[PDB]
Design a protein around this ligand. Structure first.
Ligand SMILES: *[C@@H](C)[C@@H](O)CCCOCCOC(=O)CCCC
Lengths: 214, 228
RNA sequence: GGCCGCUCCAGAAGAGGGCCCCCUUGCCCGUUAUCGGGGGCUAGGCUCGAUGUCGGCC
């Protein structure tokens, strides 16, 4: 019977200088056997805190940890630019050791609506037998957005995939692709291909669409 | 700065296959440590795999690798190993080797205090295949505030990675190359896009340069607007 | 009614075992290894013990 570690929120946005708190709940008591790790993209985790609140050697003192029952918190007292990263908690009260799923600390900026573009499949692709329809959401903030595909006004489900960039290194926005993949046969069964986008930066949902052929 | 862990042995294997990972340690003795393997599937969290105490030979394993994976250590080489048999697609991950320092004054092992750089393990039955590259063309319809969007759809390659540049690296501003998605076919796909001034479309040439080292492919695709 | 027992029956019977919580390991302890103390539960299901509503002897 393992002990689960549940981290919330999955991500949060903050600015340099903010006080940041990250929380993790053990499914049952782990006494005081919790560690916190920092991981940057493409890099190995580093130990920050062990035994709930003890700083590991060399870790800056703006990092601290505390416990309230099964709730464990990592606090960064004044967030520095090198602190944008993902943070993981882990218990070692009982084997097997288990990790929380992580909290990504991201850069806060002003709201930015996406610019939306839709791309029909190329004739090259159609000749090969497939039809990818691409909808682009460019340079928006915050990350949350809802992308809906409609084919002849019928809402699509299960036949699309999304991909989202990491925060731009220059302007801190996100960009996102949603790709609707039909067979050539299915794509020719319909006329209107529409991508509908909801985002905080938009007063009402934006729809880009095209008519097959035209 | 003296503690180092150097993983090797990762690679691409078919389901059912085997790999041996190595973790070469310096700056400390393996017999004064607990050595671990922890893996991280693409875009996911950390999953403990196996631990070993080279001093005692004691080992432990995640339930889902028991019988398949064997962790071992050669103290004469200060190296730990993970022998991985009966590999499957869900084992695809970066595998990190990590250390817990032994403290004779303590009474149990504590946290994972140092982690190596990681080695990538990919388990797939897919065959190596270069991408098909299709244009994402701008049309006169879709000009938003003096800005056009165009791109390249880089579809059905294996494995990772592909690199994409634009105009042989002369075009970098406004470029977004999205993370690849693993399609249900077992092949990868991604798009790279760029926004440019719409007035430029007649007098500028936009080419995406797609490189896929595993297939030794370099493909240049001119992306131009469709008219009428 | 006595004595000797637990082979059988009874649950009237309490330890083992198992789960949870507190104390930053906190008398002493601690397998290259997570303890100890305290608290909250679990009973007739296994082991051991005890008992008689049981068995044997007189
Ligand atoms: C043994 C000392 C302990 O069980 C007695 C305490 C009374 O609580 C209920 C009985 O405990 C059990 O359930 C034991 C089950 C073992 C198979």
């Amino acid at each position: 019977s393992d002990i689960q570690m549940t981290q919330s929120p999955s991500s949060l946005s903050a600015s340099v200088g903010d006080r940041v708190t990250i929380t993790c709940r053990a499914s049952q008591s782990v006494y005081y056997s919790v560690a916190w790790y920092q991981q940057k993209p493409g890099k190995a985790p580093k130990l920050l805190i062990y035994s709930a609140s003890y700083l590991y050697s060399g870790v800056p003192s703006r990092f601290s940890g505390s416990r309230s029952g099964t709730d464990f918190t990592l606090t960064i007292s004044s967030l520095q630019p090198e602190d944008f990263a993902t943070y993981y908690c882990q218990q070692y009260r009982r084997r097997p050791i288990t990790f929380g799923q992580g909290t990504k600390v991201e850069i806060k900026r002003t709201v930015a609506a996406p610019s939306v573009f839709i791309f029909p499949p190329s004739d090259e692709q159609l000749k090969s037998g497939t039809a990818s329809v691409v909808c682009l959401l460019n340079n928006f903030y915050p990350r949350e957005a809802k992308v809906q595909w409609k084919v002849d006004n019928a809402l699509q489900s299960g036949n699309s995939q999304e991909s989202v960039t990491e925060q731009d290194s220059k302007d801190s926005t996100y960009s996102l692709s949603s790709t609707l993949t039909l067979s050539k046969a299915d794509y020719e069964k319909h006329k209107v291909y529409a991508c509908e986008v909801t985002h905080q930066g938009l007063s009402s949902p934006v729809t880009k669409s095209f008519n097959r052929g035209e | 700065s003296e503690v180092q862990l150097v993983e090797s042995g990762g690679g691409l294997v078919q389901p059912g296959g085997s790999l041996r990972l190595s973790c070469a340690a310096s700056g400390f003795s393996l017999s004064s440590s607990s050595m671990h393997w922890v893996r991280q599937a693409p875009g996911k969290g950390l999953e403990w795999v196996a631990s070993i105490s080279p001093y005692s030979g004691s080992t432990s394993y995640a339930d889902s690798v028991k019988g398949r994976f064997t962790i071992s250590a050669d103290t004469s080489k200060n190296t730990a190993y993970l022998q991985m048999n009966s590999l499957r697609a869900e084992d695809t991950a970066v595998y990190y080797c990590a250390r817990t320092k032994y403290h004779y004054k303590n009474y149990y092992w504590w946290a994972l205090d140092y982690w190596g750089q990681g080695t990538l393990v990919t388990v797939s039955s897919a065959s190596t295949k270069g991408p098909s590259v299709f244009p994402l063309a701008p049309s006169s319809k879709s000009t938003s505030g003096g800005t056009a969007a165009l791109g390249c759809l880089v579809k059905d390659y294996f494995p990772e990675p592909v690199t994409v540049s634009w105009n042989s690296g002369a075009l970098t501003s406004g470029v977004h190359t999205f993370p690849a998605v693993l399609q249900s076919s077992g092949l990868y796909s991604l798009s790279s896009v760029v926004t440019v001034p719409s007035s430029s479309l007649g007098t500028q040439t936009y080419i995406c340069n797609v490189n896929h080292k595993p297939s030794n492919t370099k493909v240049d695709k001119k992306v131009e607007p469709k008219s009428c």
